[PDB]
Amino acid sequence: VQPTKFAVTVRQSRNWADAKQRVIAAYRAWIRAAPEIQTMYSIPFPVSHIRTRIRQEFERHRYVNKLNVVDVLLQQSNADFQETMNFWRQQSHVMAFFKEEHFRGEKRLPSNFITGFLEGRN
Amino acid sequence: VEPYPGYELRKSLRKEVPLPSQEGTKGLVQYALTTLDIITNWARQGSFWPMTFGLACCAVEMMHLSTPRYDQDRLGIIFRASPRQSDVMIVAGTLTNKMAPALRQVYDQMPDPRWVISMGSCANGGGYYHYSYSVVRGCDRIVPVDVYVPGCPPTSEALMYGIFQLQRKMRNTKITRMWYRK
Amino acid sequence: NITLILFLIGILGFVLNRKNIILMLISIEIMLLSITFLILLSSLNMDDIIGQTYAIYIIVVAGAESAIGLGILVAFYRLRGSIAIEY
Amino acid sequence: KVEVYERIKSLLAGFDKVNDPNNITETAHFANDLGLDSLDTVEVVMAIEEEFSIEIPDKDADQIHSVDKAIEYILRQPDA
Amino acid sequence: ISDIHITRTGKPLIRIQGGRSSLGEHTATVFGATGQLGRYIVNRLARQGCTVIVPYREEMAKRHLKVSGDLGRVIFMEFDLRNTQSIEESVRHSDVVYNLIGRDYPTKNFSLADVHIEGTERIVEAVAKYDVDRFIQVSTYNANPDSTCEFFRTKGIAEKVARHVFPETTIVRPAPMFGFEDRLLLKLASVTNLFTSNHMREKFWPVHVNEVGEALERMLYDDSTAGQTFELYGPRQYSMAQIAELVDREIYKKRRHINLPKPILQPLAELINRVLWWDTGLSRDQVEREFHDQVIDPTAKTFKDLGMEPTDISKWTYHYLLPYRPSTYYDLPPSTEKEMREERKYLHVLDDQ
């Protein structure tokens, strides 16, 4: 806020009820900003595709049961959110977040044993 | 079955034209086009305006080329702040990953004809920071480079030698004769 | 004759314009120039330097009133943020 | 009002995370009746916010957990 | 699809799949790589750590190609199509040769037959002399040696010459391609007026230049594409008018075509090509080409055979034409009542400054 546009002072969560509000607050800001993110970096994907990525990022950490670890993830989310909504990231940075735009594909690991073996460890 | 009817006989009348590097000027229309070639190249050499992307300590040696001892202005070199007014990009410094998008952007904003001079070990292949997590291992990963100047830092005279090489490159550039070949 | 046609152009500026208030200021400038041009040409026909003097004071006054009108527009725009009429 | 509900069906029925369509009521809940977990609910309120073109505060959004709660909330807000 | 590729002549290529520094094992020559399509095949090979031989004419034109590969991967060769030594010096080490040399207009130095028929014939003869494994010859849609249109005709004989000298020639027939630096989307989007003597009624199936470049790469990897023929086109048929509708729909500008009649435009098109020194987009055989309508051969391999699904051009107009839509404040649509009301919360002039 005061230092720069989307700056959030680093604070610990008081309890699990406090943490959950921040996590939902963080998700709400992210998926709300998805229309702006598309037109601001000229992303060649629909807001639906972008918003799915937001949920998966939040779902990788759905099973965390440690309060200190949540505070770390919340601070990372605020830092990524600020550097996105401020035009500090470049199209290369945001585009790299979408795993489909790598010339070797998104399925960058072998499907099963025999496809990886026939190609040579993937 | 001789694809087209005269295919077999036509293999003996195929004129073999010389390569541009070993071609000559004979006549008047040829001579005219070399004259414009000389004239247009003399102007490119005579007003050599670099856009100094002075990333680090190589910019100090680059800055010493405009000072009284060497006085690049005596040869027609004027440093330009924006890529719009510039003909040559001198990458003089370590190109970090964080900085590479900016370098590509200013290269894209340079009008043709344009050239890039990589100056210094860092700009050339990464230099002392080749094994760093934050360094591009040579600006030729990002932009095409016309001349590489070695040294960390190259001396002011070494930079001048590279600029002379690029001028000699312009002086041998075929423009009106290249279109005249094809 | 040209001066008459110009007065119509300034007149026609008010007929055709529903929403451009800046065009209203410009159409007054066209009318005033048209009337000053008429005085100048007539002053030439009647060999009268007073016509040229009258035209000089119209240029002075019309220049003075353009500045007042722009200042009034600036005070207006400071509060509204638009010179567009919603119509 | 009733005009809000007919717009409410336009997005919940289009939502792909509903357990079964036509399960929507005038007072249905996202969690108990419609089988929506936490974040799917966050997304539904965000879709309603877009329809009425009014931003919803995070505290107000937490209060909204049912189809009726949203219908009541949008009416109170002047923008629509 | 693996760490081993065995070439037509048997060479085993043990390959380390990766990025810039990896070992692709292939040595490729790409003729006409300095044009619109040559950048996508050269880029695809070099970034896999394959050696790409690039024969060029203008030095300043080929400078962007070097960025694709690691050090020592993109190799430049001075070449003329009438210098045989240069053609076969560029080819004797390669295991695959792409012929992308074409031109839509005749020049003072090259007739359409000189660049296409005689051009291919010198290259294909070099390919057979050194036993190159794969010779992929790029051609045109509607390629037919019985066509009145010299473009289509000279693309027809060159197919027959290539297949005669080198029976395993792979022929690729692309439809007009769109994309970055294309001559379809930007030509419509840029030139103020077009001299089209057919009311833009020629139809075709546009295909992304990216997919053609990717397809060319996929033929290298499968030995089953040799001796085959590939018509390569997009999913849906368009016409120059319908695509112009998309272009206008994206840049907020109105297309204007003069549409002079054929008996008058065609000789004029000849004059302009013989007095102007660049591609004017207008020539005698190009005016004739606009009456023809792309007819797809039914006995030719498609993207299906390569495992690809072309995208429709209307999916790409917004992406490729976004930098051409005006974004000045003067051009936004009128403010909503929501916007009119919020303006009254701000001072709009600094009176203290």
Ligand SMILES: NC(=O)C1=CN([C@@H]2O[C@H](COP(=O)(O)OP(=O)(O)OC[C@H]3O[C@@H](n4cnc5c(N)ncnc54)[C@H](OP(=O)(O)O)[C@@H]3O)[C@@H](O)[C@H]2O)C=CC1
């Ligand atoms: N683009 C399209 O929509 C279509 C293209 N094609 C074919 O696709 C292939 C590639 O197309 P595209 O990349 O767009 O074409 P471009 O015109 O962009 O490039 C053609 C290439 O041919 C080279 N070339 C032309 N004439 C000669 C010559 N006389 N001697 C040596 N080299 C020459 C050019 O080199 P330089 O730059 O030095 O002139 C250039 O690299 C060509 O074979 C073309 O005919 C056919 C159908 C549709």
Ligand SMILES: *P(=O)(O)OCC(C)(C)[C@H](O)C(=O)NCCC(=O)NCCSC(=O)CCCCCCCCCCCCC
């Ligand atoms: P619902 O019951 O479904 O789930 C509620 C929560 C998530 C609280 C779980 O039930 C739960 O108990 N979770 C445990 C604690 C927790 O939520 N962990 C904190 C995670 S915060 C997090 O994951 C932040 C990631 C943000 C990433 C955003 C997208 C990436 C940035 C780039 C955007 C696209 C390019 C511009």
Ligand code: SF4
């Ligand atoms: S090459 Fe040496 S002198 Fe030049 S910028 Fe890098 S470290 Fe500094």
